[PDB]
Design a protein around this ligand. Sequence first.
Ligand SMILES: CS(=O)(=O)N1CCC(O)CC1
Length: 182
Amino acid sequence: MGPGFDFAQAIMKKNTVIARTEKGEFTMLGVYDRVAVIPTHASVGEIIYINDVETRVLDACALRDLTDTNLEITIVKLDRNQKFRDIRHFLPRCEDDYNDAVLSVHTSKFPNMYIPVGQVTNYGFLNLGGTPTHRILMYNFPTRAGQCGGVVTTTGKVIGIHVGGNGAQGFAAMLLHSYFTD
Ligand SMILES: CS(=O)(=O)N1CCC(O)CC1
């Protein structure tokens, strides 16, 4: 409907796949080459389904900060025959607050879904499902089951992936450029 939805659409149409694990279907952001991200609670194993194709997992790393605290981001390298468009230049370098974000989801349950979530707070610490978690972004939208893995963007920046909510607020794990240096 406007330039925020324009940027979100451009990321969804080229840099997302539908990931299925034994814990369900997730929006999965591809970042560069065969490297993607997914919430750590998806519990990635040795085999994952990508757009309903059986795919070997070459590597999966659940990220933690240097306090050894959960970040709720898993970086997955896929044995896929095709590379993602490199979007690492759209990743923020530091922790920040944002205005006017969009949360975008694409699954069997929620295809082509875009949510204007408004102001994004650098929330920091969250007890997420009983797990202490750092680098959490918060937005005042009542997000629902089916939205985990959703991509959070502003105009020109890919800032996080949706990892939970409390019925009134939604929570994303930050994406930082430093997670994807090769
Ligand atoms: C899905 S959840 O309940 O928000 N939660 C995610 C983090 C994990 O460590 C515990 C479970």
